Symmetry: C4
Subunit: 390 residues, 4 copies
């Protein structure tokens, strides 16, 4: 019985640096001989012995003949696949875990838990897979696209928590939390506080007692709903992030939202999933966030940090920490994950870099990686080097 | 000595849902760079640690230059191959186990048993392989295409049973059962009861004492010969399925076969292999069957269930349980298999979706998967997304 | 310390049957997307847990641009490669072990021993590799193409024996035997008896004390030099095969060589490597041989058996045992090997089927497999299904 | 806790022989179906159970559409990748470890340590990765292209040493040494003696106490700076090689540098990384070096040996030991590494054979291998067999 995974102390360090870049389409030339899968919503989750790179493929490759439709986000073809982090995710290299147009996964220290969501928009369903066996499901409660995180779920002592949501993109979307153990939902948690619209939550362990999430409100505020979840009482409350450094996109100039922490401000219809990871020290807590550069578009991506404090009531702007991607490169979904070293955990931030070339061609994405290593300051940015005409 | 496999209690659940789809030809475009094998008669078998996807390749790929002949079912080129369930079965990814134009396989908890059938139609022969070593054979007794199940054989406490048949497709085809242990036939069983024509049996454990099979009669009835095999006395009897929900194809309207359970009705020359799996509860028994939608063609596929009762003498129609495939998609051979979770077994139903485009092109198939997970009702159907012009 | 390999009793059986066929060029169409290596002199060797398929690649693939030269047998590019038996030997799937234009290998029960031969014709050299480390060599003693078996070397209790030869193809070629242990030559054996010309020896264990070989004399007789090697006294003697069923090619009509066992007869310049394997019973000894059909060309291949007796002095023709390949298909080098089952050994015969299309195109080969399984008679032959115009 | 790696006694032997050649571009024809990565600066490092082949890919393949730029040595795309020695390094077969335009790696007996260098020329940074986790960094001290060895770092009892350098290529480049343990720099060593310009050091264990390196001075002498590093006192001193057999390239005729050991002679602006490995005997020490044939260009490569003596003060020319590559083939970077046999170490010499075809096409390299095996003399040379027009 390989003991259960538990959050540890982060490894010593004080800055992020360019780590690894998976640009599969650097090999999809019409004149090349490779078959890189067409995907989106990628993310990484790590176990005690290995890190896996997950994504939602449109079940097609480049070069191929099924580019039309790769732009849509839901259909009966999309599948959750994954490869060892470091391997190019190609047709042959990939493992198709289950059909889904929305997913997540995490390793409890013994086995992998794979979460996938598919079905009709009005009654979609969450499927849970533990290793090889399909073991449970969950139904749409708001009957409007049951969806999940698009990032690693979190496990502790055997219990894994996962945020799911149901509702209109431009309306009410009260999220919920699932407490999964060995593949089956053993509890349903209903969040408290600001619950109007919450989704695509990037969660992580702030400690052995609390799991925190930075999320996405898609129709009311440029501020990010921030979840705090007590693992001991299994209760969860939500409140908007008080910092003037709005992490969502689009958004207005920093600090331009008048009023107290809780004020939503202009709707700024839409948003984006943002990265977020913890830096657990003995008596301090680093909270790293990522956010696109352009205030209105998905271009560039910068790193931000803020040690200690209550994100719920601290308006002091975040400390800029570096340019992971320039505004000349695409910066879409970002997520956080943690690599497990011999005696400590290593926080990282992934960055989906979408190759959007329009509706009349393929639509895929690279994945850029930045982790905590050493001191000083972020030294280098990331590019995809991909030309969509090849 | 990794203990022997034994049938367990099915995992809690009350409905089937779209699980996984392996559509290898979504990657065989003339403009792509993949090499998906051309196959047919696919099926899945699982061991304690992994599930493998088997099939009969025509030893050619798409795109290739050997499409002519992929339509025929027997020749000196066909081979039994397999890959980990989840991997696209391609030239590089596949393992060729042995030459055969008819096969089956199962895992006894220690090693894999591979069964293949090849040779001349008038004197074909069954080859048994245990892991790496070829260990035994069996000769044609009716000298007319010795053939096997095309689905997982079943093992218990070390002994594996397998149905084989010999005879005319439109005549007598008395099937037999082989009791294999560690690679060698240790017993031959002769069925009792209705034995005129029985084949392509989909078998599974109804319990530790009985192995049941839903089979195919190809020249007399649209009803399905149903086998019951006692593992303790090693005797087996056959009788036709009494339900008015005829599972074969072609077939007439349900309940239209006048007379008692045993009446054959019109010949309805031909048939098809059908899916069938068990749902073992503490004091109840679920029996799941699949059958094409069109009464005369291989289009669409619906799921059916029926708890308890004696299929041999119960005429009450089956309970429709969902549309796994629409009549607009192809639905050919279906089979059943079971995934092994930590403490219980998970029943599933595979569906070969053949890409028939005529005699002047390639002929291959995808494999759609549906397993028992959660409650409610089957929510979504499966498509292949493959265009045979690419 | 995983105990050393020792010859065991063959598994029960009384006939050979078509087992497996590796036709890599069924995937090398100019219109396909595969990269099967161009090779020759293939063979199989098995360990306790797996069988590997070895060959000498010309370091090129089909389709490619380096076909010119694939016809020559020696150069600075040829390499010894291998894959798990069952996997198509392609660029990606293969493992290049060492450069060589002549080779062999065997598993002592702990590690693999790889033998390769390269260098100039006048001073070639034998390289020995044990697992990952290169550990020893052997120099040309007759300074005229030091060459080896082209088939599995044989190991026992830790000591592996290997036949090597040096000399003119149409002249003297006194072979020698190397006794290798853990990668290093611990002894050199000089054969006794008829030693004029001996090579490409197919060796195997007739028992724990004797290793026997059927070989190739290339310039004097159509008869096959037969080696007997005592493992206890580490001495070896050679004498020509006395049977009237000449195994070499070319050769004259059977029994047409007048005189006693030892008479050479007409030169019949040239020859071919032939298959040969043992069937060890409790008190009997089966000796299986293969030989092409055409008396003058490499077309077709039939199986022959002969239980007990002394091949050195028995002129009774061999018992025809079946047509493994028809005279319409190519039949080149054949070899023997043994698969290791749980409690007994399973003898097999490999058949290199060369796709010779001339000097102005590629030149590669498939590998056909036949093993001992069941009773009755060899039922089916093997074809390559490959068209050299694609 | 798999014990730590320690230098052992070399395996018995007295000469080098052609071992293995990895020519990935023998498969990159425009008409082939393979995808071999475009790389440079390859090298090998071995652990107790396996040897890995590392290199710096330009994140492109042949055939591809990203050839422009493959000539430059630094950019945000270059990555450190590796495959099991014996496998062709292709898109699918390779593992991308981390982004870098300069690297090294070594196995401490438990885990792999990967070193990579990227960032801006004026402030580049060294990243250390231990297995899966990124664990430490090191900053540029001379702010001018922080670079590393391009060959296996060396570990002992758990502590790994690595040479790094910072400075102008045609000026001062005082190198430094890092003492890494379990992924983190636990010490910084400043060399003593001739420290004007030292880089691309090829290091190895001369004994349990000393690690020696043959390096590259790029702007002052054709002589090779030779490092001696005491592992017990963790101090290191440098002095130029005194032999008249200048190992650098370009260089003047041997022995033409007038003066004592320390004299630099004409600048001979430029240089090259050279191979160097040890042959540890009980009471003798073999030191093997490689150097291109042409005195001014990177063509051909010969092996040299010299037992015992102090390279710092011995002017006796080295003993020519063979032609590994002819002056008609390209001979670029050469390095040394050691394979670990059951009870002794086996020294080898790698040779990067660059396919330079100009600035208007691709630029990649094969890797030729020669190891210590047997006695006599190096018998055969190596060719790439690659035609850059295909
Ligand atoms: C409808 C809700 C919306 C977020 C506010 N979801 C969403 C947004 C984008 C995007 O803004 O680019 C891309 C994909 C999705 N997804 C879907 O449409 C199904 C679930 C998934 C997965 O693809 C992630 O939420
Ligand atoms: C001749 C008997 C008939 C079933 C009544 N078999 C059969 C039917 C079909 C089909 O109806 O599409 C496809 C393949 C076969 N098979 C053969 O011809 C050889 C054995 C195998 C395997 O391919 C399965 O029975
Ligand atoms: C010169 C001796 C001759 C056998 C009598 N060898 C030989 C014959 C053939 C053939 O007759 O088709 C093919 C290859 C070889 N080989 C060589 O030329 C080098 C060694 C090897 C390996 O290829 C096997 O002996
Ligand atoms: C600028 C210093 C110079 C050596 C004197 N480096 C160097 C030389 C060559 C070559 O002479 O062909 C190729 C690559 C490099 N490298 C770089 O430019 C970055 C580091 C690396 C790796 O590619 C190795 O030193
Ligand atoms: C962040 C943190 O302190 N996590 C703790 C870890 O230190 C401890 O070893 C473990 C025991 O379950 O619980 C967790
Ligand atoms: C369906 C069923 O009950 N199967 C039984 C299982 O419960 C039991 O543990 C095992 C012991 O051999 O035998 C089988
Ligand atoms: C052919 C034969 O009998 N081989 C014997 C085997 O039976 C025995 O178990 C072993 C012990 O070393 O030696 C070998
Ligand atoms: C070159 C050399 O002698 N290396 C020694 C080795 O012999 C010894 O077994 C080991 C113990 O740590 O230390 C190292
Ligand atoms: Ca592949
Ligand atoms: Ca928003
Ligand atoms: Ca491949
Ligand atoms: Ca019927
Ligand atoms: Ca591949
Ligand atoms: Ca002859
Ligand atoms: Ca591949
Ligand atoms: Ca120099």
């Amino acid at each position: 019985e390989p003991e259960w995974t538990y959050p540890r102390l982060s490894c010593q360090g004080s800055t992020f640096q360019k780590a690894l870049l998976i640009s599969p389409h650097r090999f999809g030339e019409i004149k090349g001989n490779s078959a890189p899968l067409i995907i989106r919503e990628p993310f990484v989750a790590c176990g005690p012995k290995e890190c896996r790179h997950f994504a939602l493929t449109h079940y097609a490759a480049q070069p191929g003949g099924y580019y039309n439709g790769t732009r849509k986000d839901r259909n009966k073809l999309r599948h959750l696949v994954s490869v060892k982090l470091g391997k190019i995710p190609t047709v042959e290299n990939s493992i198709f875990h289950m059909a889904a147009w929305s997913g997540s996964a995490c390793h409890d220290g013994r086995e992998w838990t794979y979460i996938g969501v598919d079905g009709p928009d009005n009654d979609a369903l969450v499927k849970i897979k533990y290793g090889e066996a399909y073991t449970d499901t969950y139904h749409s409660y708001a009957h409007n696209i049951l969806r999940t995180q698009e990032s690693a779920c979190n496990c502790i002592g055997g219990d894994c928590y996962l945020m799911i949501t149901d509702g209109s993109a431009s309306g009410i979307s009260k999220c919920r939390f699932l407490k999964i153990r060995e593949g089956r939902i053993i509890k349903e948690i209903l969040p408290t506080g600001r619950v109007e619209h919450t989704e695509e939550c990037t969660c992580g362990f702030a400690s052995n007692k609390t799991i925190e999430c930075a999320c996405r409100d898609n129709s009311y505020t440029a501020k990010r709903p921030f979840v705090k979840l007590n693992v001991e009482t299994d209760t969860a409350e939500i409140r908007l992030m008080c910092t003037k450094t709005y992490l969502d996109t689009p958004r207005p100039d920093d600090g331009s939202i008048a009023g107290p922490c809780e004020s939503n401000g202009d709707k700024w219809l839409g948003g984006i999933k943002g990265g977020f990871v913890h830096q657990r020290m003995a008596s301090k807590i680093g909270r790293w966030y990522s956010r696109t550069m352009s205030k209105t578009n998905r271009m560039g991506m910068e790193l931000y940090v803020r040690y200690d404090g209550d994100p719920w009531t601290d308006s002091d702007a975040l400390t800029l920490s570096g340019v992971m991607v320039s505004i000349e490169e695409p910066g879409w979904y970002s997520f956080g994950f943690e690599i497990k070293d011999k005696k400590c955990d290593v926080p990282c931030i992934g960055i989906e870099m979408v190759h959007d070339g329009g509706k009349d061609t393929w639509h895929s994405a690279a994945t850029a990686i930045y982790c905590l290593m050493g001191s000083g300051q972020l030294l280098w940015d990331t590019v995809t080097g991909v030309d969509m005409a090849l």
